[PDB]
Write a protein that binds this ligand. Structure first.
Ligand SMILES: CCCCCCCCCCCCCCCCCC(=O)OC[C@H](COP(=O)([O-])OCC(O)COP(=O)([O-])OC[C@@H](COC(=O)CCCCCCCCCCCCCCCCC)OC(=O)CCCCCCCCCCCCCCCCC)OC(=O)CCCCCCCCCCCCCCCCC
Ligand code: BCL
Ligand code: BCL
Ligand SMILES: C/C=C1/c2cc3[nH]c4c(c3C)C(=O)[C@H](C(=O)OC)c4c3nc(cc4[nH]c(cc(n2)[C@@H]1C)c(C(C)=O)c4C)[C@@H](C)[C@@H]3CCC(=O)OC/C=C(\C)CCC[C@H](C)CCC[C@H](C)CCCC(C)C
Ligand SMILES: C/C=C1/c2cc3[nH]c4c(c3C)C(=O)[C@H](C(=O)OC)c4c3nc(cc4[nH]c(cc(n2)[C@@H]1C)c(C(C)=O)c4C)[C@@H](C)[C@@H]3CCC(=O)OC/C=C(\C)CCC[C@H](C)CCC[C@H](C)CCCC(C)C
Ligand SMILES: COC(C)(C)C/C=C/C(C)=C/C=C/C(C)=C/C=C/C(C)=C/C=C/C=C(C)/C=C/C=C(/C)CC/C=C(\C)CCC=C(C)C
Ligand SMILES: COC(C)(C)C/C=C/C(C)=C/C=C/C(C)=C/C=C/C(C)=C/C=C/C=C(C)/C=C/C=C(\C)CC/C=C(\C)CCC=C(C)C
Ligand SMILES: COC(C)(C)C/C=C/C(C)=C/C=C/C(C)=C/C=C/C(C)=C/C=C/C=C(C)/C=C/C=C(\C)CC/C=C(\C)CCC=C(C)C
Ligand SMILES: COC(C)(C)C/C=C/C(C)=C/C=C/C(C)=C/C=C/C(C)=C/C=C/C=C(C)/C=C/C=C(\C)CC/C=C(\C)CCC=C(C)C
Ligand SMILES: COC(C)(C)C/C=C/C(C)=C/C=C/C(C)=C/C=C/C(C)=C/C=C\C=C(C)\C=C\C=C(/C)CC/C=C(\C)CCC=C(C)C
Ligand SMILES: COC(C)(C)C\C=C/C(C)=C/C=C/C(C)=C/C=C/C(C)=C/C=C/C=C(C)/C=C/C=C(\C)CC/C=C(\C)CCC=C(C)C
Ligand SMILES: [Fe+2]
Lengths: 50, 281, 42, 54, 305, 53, 39, 54, 43, 54, 43, 54, 43, 54, 43
């Protein structure tokens, strides 16, 4: 079995990559994508659902 | 031979390969299967270093150097006196390190402790393999590795760094240096604190962990604790080595220019790229 | 139910949530209509 | 949507509402940034061009 | 499977105000908030912090040093917040030009303000050292932290105060910038030949790698034997248990020799003070005694010549 | 053809969250690919149709 | 295992209903796109 | 309005008010910075051009 | 329900005052936008 | 309206006062720096130019 | 209800004095902006 | 106005006085440094030029 | 209400002394600005 | 002057005296260094110039 | 107050001694500034 923390980390990583590509396209720069994706991923991963 | 408490811990078990075979001690050392392997590889490497010194024509231990094959050989074999000995010694060094780690695992499971020490050692083995195997293999030749000499591998460090201008503009390099400096600071503070509690002013009783907690709470306003400080030391050391390995693996494979030029992406951000002031304007 | 929240509570919460979603969608629809009048994208 | 409140008895409404608000704001900001990137729909440049504001 | 790297359950009770050996309790503050992240890794409690006279001195001087450097950076930015954020890591306070020597007549824009900030920093650091000594004394402990900090101070003093005086110029000192002091170290190595061939540079690097090696080894050992309560080392010194015995036997069966629960800390403190001490000596030797370290190595059997 | 036992094996919340994230990310990447190509970039071809540029 | 067979039946049924609704909207969208610009 | 008052049965007012204040301020700052970054609508530069301040 | 502890009347009164504040903030924003649009329109 | 005072039963007055003071000072300093960095509204430079100080 | 804990009659008086302070601060700000606009308008 | 004295029943006067002293000194030092960095209002250089000290 | 342990009378006297100090400081600052403006006006 | 003595009913005189000593010394040293930094008012260099020391 | 424990008489005497010290220090500072200004005025 996998832990709830482990699931949060997997989904945080995929959300980080997704939102990063998303806002690197939206903004002109990859740094915008990195910042927005990392903030969203940190917020998602810091709040386990159990 | 034995420590005053050692006898009850020497019991027949915990091996990985073999059984009662190789399950004995030689003096203080434990010599299992991987003890034999480690000894063989280490002795072979040391004799080959001495024979390379014979070939090179020097007996000064600070001038002995074993050079990797030239770039014209690529990732193939080389003549023994022209890079083959370096390759053999590299194989021996890798074998010695991996057998040392496996021997440590055997000792860990004979004593009933966790395997934190072999894991930590494996981090260093991976840094060595990054410098000697992974980066040369990606870069295409064994000649991008470093030579086995006391002052010539420092020449390798200098030349490799100055290929990319000033090397401490590499970002992962900056992270690794910060971790190394922080680790040395933490080690000094930790050793000093434990000693000061165990060795108080003359004629005083030993201090307690409460006194240590109070000392750092008085000093900086926070105490991380004993478990906390040991976790911090392990992670600081491992993160330093991990980020050094990263900064080297990205150096000749993804990056090719001066790193000070890499730092221009922040300056050329569109919303302040052209504001006329400061240093870059 | 993982949350333990009962059927009637779920029905009432869903009704209010649907009303809010409809209000949001109505505002978005009128915004799109105004922008399409201003500058069609088709 | 004959019976969709089952997701409300499965999911804790506070967490769902936080995630939904964050997601909706991000989606709106993204679409706005995409429109601002394209010169055809950059309404600030459109207004500057049609009023000769240079 | 639990590796004891992160806590899996976290408990909170009343805050611990600390010991009262002979500390002036009026100079302490209250306890701060508890933090769950720090609780995951270590202790959750923040504070109370002691702040006495030496603390006021250190805070004032360090605040003035930080403020002086920051206001200079704002002047360089043209008082523009956007330029200040963009060219942060590029601003620097430079020491006086080499023409002024050690004199205090350099202008404010040239090197005078660097001197003001350096005075503030000197006062702050020496008052902080005094604070570490006095905080150790109040609780009745030994002063090991003070002497290790004195080693670090020795390297800092050589870099910023002692070597510029021996060289006879303030321009030899380090600038206050992020990239600027990095460029300073690179230029220092280039001007003095090759700092790799400074032998005390080599010793300092040996002891830095040794600090990393030793304290990975020691953290891993304590985490490995913490199933026996190994992290409570102060009582493993007083009452040796199976944790200390197993640690000693691991390292004795591995590398032939071992330590105690206290001797390992002696090893640790010395391994770090040595990196900083040898570094101070090696920097003091550069330029005053050896102007070209590679040629020194050639004359001393370290380079092929 | 039962296929309902996936709710037995996995927690339904994990299944819902994973599939929602995957579906949204996939749709967004498809839209980005469409915008990247000179054709099917509906904003650019809308500009060309109405002579916006 | 926290769910029973009845609960799994109901959850799967509602989820398939929603999935078919989503697929219907996707069908009409794809048809509109194909009419607007065939591929 | 209709039934929205029940959102406060769910969300704690302190958390909501703090997050709302931070969000509103950051949104206002972002819109202002976007307007300053365009050569048009940069009210400081266009007033300088209108009154010939340079 | 018992997530926060506010009863029905408290939630209703809190929402009423919150909506008063929201409408005041919106009215100020509307006046600001009208002034800016008179000064320099974006459409 | 007329019942905004209830906000003080939601927020601790001293925390709000500290945050408000810090916020107001930082905002004022940021605006003053923005006006100093602009060649226009740099009151020191325009006063120097008007009175021929250089 | 009072989560921090203040009687409604304590909250009313705290808000009255807070409004007094806010209005004084904002009036000083209006006078400053009026002076700056007369000296050097930005519209 | 007349009712402000009640700020002291919220804030500790000791902490307020220490923060206020630090704030005032840092503000004054910053303004003096800003004036010094300006070619005009550098009173030392102004006196040097007026009396031909250089 | 009295989070600091000060009553109404203690607060009133404290504020009186603080007002006197503030007005003294402000008078000195005003005179300094008047002297500097006469010496070198910034408007 | 008028009633400022009550400050000593609020502040511990030890802390006040230590803070004054630290502040006054640091300020005096800073002003002296600033005066030495100016080519004028550097009493050593101008005494050297007026007596032809160098 | 209870903040420090000094009585009114102790505080008054302490302030008298403190003010004597302050006036001596300020007198010396004024004499030094007068000397410097006669020697090299900064205005
Ligand atoms: C011929 C040449 C070769 C020379 C040597 C050769 C001789 C043969 C070999 C000798 C080697 C012996 C090594 C063993 C020492 C271990 C002793 C020990 O750890 O425990 C005992 C003892 C305390 O043991 P304990 O059981 O824990 O006591 C508990 C107490 O109850 C309660 O605690 P406490 O309050 O009593 O104090 C606790 C502390 C106490 O120990 C101390 O008190 C140390 C005092 C500070 C170091 C002295 C330098 C400070 C400057 C002088 C001004 C102060 C002097 C007066 C000190 C006050 C003492 C009352 O104990 C410690 O463990 C601290 C360990 C870390 C000390 C690191 C100090 C580095 C400071 C950096 C200075 C840099 C400036 C100059 C650099 C060099 C210039 C080129 O500690 C010491 O004695 C420390 C010795 C300090 C050595 C100083 C370093 C020498 C550096 C030379 C480098 C090589 C030169 C190459 C360059 C040449 C250039 C030309
Ligand atoms: C880490 C990144 C760089 C590198 C950069 C540097 C720099 C820069 C310096 C050194 C220095 C040293 N390096 Mg090197 N070094 C690298 C890889 C290695 C490897 C390896 C197999 O990976 C080894 C064994 C060494 C060995 C050494 C020592 C000769 C010396 C002190 C190290 C030390 O004490 O560490 C901590 C370990 C201990 C304290 C434990 C004891 C280890 C002993 C001292 C090792 C002796 C090895 C012996 C000479 C050779 C084998 C037989 N280097 C790579 C290429 N190394 C310094 C020096 O003085 O060089 C002349 C120096 O200035
Ligand atoms: C091109 C660059 C040059 C070079 C130039 C230099 C120079 C120049 C120096 C070093 C120094 C060192 N170098 Mg070298 N170095 C090179 C290559 C290397 C390599 C490598 C693998 O290539 C390595 C591992 C090293 C490693 C080392 C370290 C062992 C050593 C620094 C110790 C330390 O902790 O300093 C950092 C610690 C300090 C400076 C002490 C600080 C203590 C004070 C008290 C702190 C005050 C903080 C202030 C109050 C902070 C406020 C903070 C807030 C409270 C948060 N160098 C090459 C050849 N290196 C130093 C040395 O000693 O050399 C002999 C040195 O001066
Ligand atoms: C990752 C965090 C740190 C880390 C961690 C840990 N490190 C460990 C452990 C942990 C946890 C152990 O458990 C283990 C051990 O038991 O410790 C006592 C070990 C060890 N760390 C050594 C050296 C070391 N650690 C370095 C770095 C870090 N360590 C980083 C920083 C550095 C440098 C350069 O910085 C060096 C030199 C040996 C002393 C020892 C292996 C002995 C061996 O394997 O013997 C078997 C091999 C031999 C006796 C000799 C074999 C000789 C070959 C054939 C010829 C080689 C020639 C060579 C290439 C020439 C170069 C010039
Ligand atoms: C053995 C050699 C190691 C070592 C040793 C030791 N280092 C010590 C001690 C020991 C033993 C202490 O006891 C003492 C302390 O209290 O620790 C908690 C101290 C400290 N080492 C600091 C910085 C530092 N150590 C570095 C390196 C190493 N140090 C090396 C590796 C490096 C770099 C560049 O690598 C840096 C930047 C500060 C955190 C702190 C002093 C704060 C100060 O002086 O404040 C005074 C200055 C201020 C308060 C300014 C504040 C400015 C505004 C407010 C912000
Ligand atoms: C590059 O790609 C581009 C950007 C061009 C296009 C790609 C686009 C995509 C992928 C767009 C996705 C759009 C989506 C997926 C939109 C879905 C939007 C949603 C999910 C909207 C729901 C809005 C619902 C809202 C605001 C609900 C408001 C509800 C409000 C009060 C009700 C609160 C609930 C309550 C009150 C009851 C109280 C409690 C009890 C116990 C009764
Ligand atoms: C880059 O963007 C630029 C810079 C271009 C522009 C962007 C700008 C923004 C986003 C600006 C933000 C403007 C805002 C939103 C400003 C906030 C203004 C406010 C709301 C200020 C509050 C003023 C209130 C003040 C000073 C309060 C005075 C209050 C008092 C003294 C309160 C007294 C309280 C008391 C005494 C204790 C009494 C206790 C009892 C029990 C009676
Ligand atoms: C870059 O931006 C620039 C620098 C260009 C411009 C930006 C500028 C700003 C943002 C300036 C802000 C200026 C401000 C915000 C100034 C506030 C100044 C204040 C608040 C001054 C207070 C003066 C009050 C003073 C000294 C205190 C007098 C207090 C007393 C003696 C204390 C007596 C009180 C007593 C003793 C205790 C009584 C005890 C009993 C028992 C009754
Ligand atoms: C870039 O910035 C530059 C440097 C250009 C300009 C910036 C400038 C500023 C911001 C300057 C501000 C200077 C200030 C703020 C000066 C304040 C000076 C003061 C207020 C000094 C007070 C000195 C008081 C002194 C010496 C008196 C100490 C008194 C004593 C020992 C008397 C003893 C009192 C006693 C003993 C109590 C015993 C009695 C009993 C009953 C126990
Ligand atoms: C908005 O932000 C504000 C403005 C509020 C503040 C932000 C501020 C910034 C951006 C601060 C920048 C801090 C930095 C970037 C500091 C760099 C510190 C570094 C990295 C120093 C690096 C090496 C420094 C070394 C070795 C210094 C050695 C210094 C010495 C021993 C002190 C020597 C003391 C002596 C020279 C001069 C003797 C003269 C007298 C009168 C004793
Ligand atoms: C270029 O375009 C970019 C890319 C920048 C982005 C484009 C667009 C977007 C995405 C814009 C976002 C617009 C939004 C979504 C704005 C949100 C606006 C809101 C939601 C404003 C709410 C204003 C409500 C306000 C001020 C209410 C404050 C309420 C109060 C005073 C009343 C509270 C008083 C009380 C509660 C006491 C409670 C009673 C008791 C008994 C405890
Ligand atoms: Fe330890």
């Amino acid at each position: 079995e996998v832990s709830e923390f482990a699931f949060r980390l997997m989904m945080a990583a995929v959300i980080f990559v997704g939102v990063g590509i998303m806002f690197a396209f939206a903004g002109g720069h990859w740094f915008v994508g990195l910042v927005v994706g990392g903030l969203v991923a940190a917020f998602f991963a810091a709040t386990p659902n159990s | 031979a034995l420590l005053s408490f050692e006898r009850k811990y020497r019991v027949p078990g915990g091996t990985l390969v073999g059984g009662n075979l190789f399950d004995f001690w030689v003096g203080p050392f434990y010599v299992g299967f991987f003890g034999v392997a480690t000894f063989f590889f280490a002795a072979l490497g040391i004799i080959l270093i001495a024979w390379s010194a014979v070939l090179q024509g020097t007996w000064n231990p600070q001038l002995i150097s074993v050079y990797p094959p030239a770039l014209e050989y690529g990732l193939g074999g080389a003549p023994l006196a022209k890079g083959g000995l370096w390759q053999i010694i590299t194989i021996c060094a890798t074998g010695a390190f991996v057998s040392w780690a496996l021997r440590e695992v055997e000792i860990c499971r004979k004593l009933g402790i966790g395997y934190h020490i072999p894991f930590a050692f494996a981090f260093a083995i991976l840094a060595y393999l990054t410098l000697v195997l992974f980066r040369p293999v990606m870069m295409g030749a064994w000649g991008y590795a470093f030579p086995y000499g006391i002052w010539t591998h420092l020449d390798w460090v200098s030349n490799t760094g100055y290929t990319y201008g000033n090397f401490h503009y590499n970002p992962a390099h900056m992270i690794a240096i910060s971790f190394f400096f922080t680790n040395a600071l933490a080690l000094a503070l930790h050793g000093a604190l434990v000693l000061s509690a165990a060795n108080p002013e003359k004629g005083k009783e030993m201090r307690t962990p409460d006194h240590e907690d109070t000392f750092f709470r008085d000093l900086v306003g926070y105490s991380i604790g004993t478990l906390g400080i040991h976790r911090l030391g392990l992670l600081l050391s491992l993160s330093a080595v991990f980020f050094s390995a990263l900064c080297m693996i990205i150096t000749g494979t993804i990056w090719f220019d001066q790193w000070v030029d890499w730092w221009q992406w922040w300056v050329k951000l569109p919303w302040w790229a052209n504001i006329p002031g400061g240093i870059n304007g | 139910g993982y949350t333990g929240l009962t059927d009637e509570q779920a029905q009432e919460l869903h009704s209010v949530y649907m009303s809010g979603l409809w209000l949001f969608s109505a505002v978005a629809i009128v915004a799109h209509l105004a922008v399409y009048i201003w500058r069609p994208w088709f | 949507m004959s019976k969709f409140y089952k997701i409300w008895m499965i999911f804790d409404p506070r967490r769902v509402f936080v995630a939904q608000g964050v997601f909706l704001f991000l989606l709106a900001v993204m679409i706005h940034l995409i429109l601002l990137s394209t010169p055809s729909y950059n309404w600030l440049e459109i207004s500057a061009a049609k009023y000769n504001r240079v | 499977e639990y590796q004891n790297i992160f806590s899996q359950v976290q408990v909170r009770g009343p805050a611990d105000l600390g010991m009262t050996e002979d500390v002036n309790l009026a100079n302490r503050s209250g306890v701060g908030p508890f933090s769950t992240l720090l609780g995951w890794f270590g202790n959750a409690q923040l504070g109370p912090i002691y702040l006495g006279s030496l603390g006021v001195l250190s805070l004032f001087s360090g605040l003035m040093w930080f403020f002086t450097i920051g206001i200079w950076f704002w002047y360089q930015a043209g008082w523009n917040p956007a330029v200040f954020l963009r060219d942060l890591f590029f601003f620097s306070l430079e020491p006086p030009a080499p023409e002024y020597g050690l004199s205090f007549a350099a202008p404010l824009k040239e090197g005078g303000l660097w001197l003001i900030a350096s005075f503030f920093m000197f006062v702050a650091v020496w008052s902080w050292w005094g604070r570490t000594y006095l905080r150790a004394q109040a609780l009745g402990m030994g002063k090991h932290t003070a002497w290790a900090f004195l080693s670090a101070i020795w390297l800092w003093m050589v870099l910023g105060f002692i070597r510029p005086i021996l060289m006879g110029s303030w321009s030899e000192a380090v600038p206050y910038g992020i990239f600027s002091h990095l460029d300073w170290t690179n230029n220092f190595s280039l001007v003095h030949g090759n700092l790799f061939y400074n032998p005390f540079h080599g010793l300092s690097i040996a002891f830095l790698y040794g600090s990393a090696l030793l304290f990975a080894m020691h953290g891993a050992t304590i985490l490995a034997v913490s199933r026996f309560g190994g992290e409570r080392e102060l009582e493993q010194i007083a009452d040796r248990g199976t944790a200390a015995e197993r640690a000693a036997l691991f390292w004795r069966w591995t590398m032939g020799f071992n330590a105690t629960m206290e001797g390992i800390h002696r090893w640790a403190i010395w391994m770090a003070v040595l990196v900083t001490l040898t570094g101070g000596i090696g920097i003091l030797l550069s330029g005053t005694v050896v102007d070209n370290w590679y040629v020194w190595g050639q004359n001393h059997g370290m380079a092929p010549l």
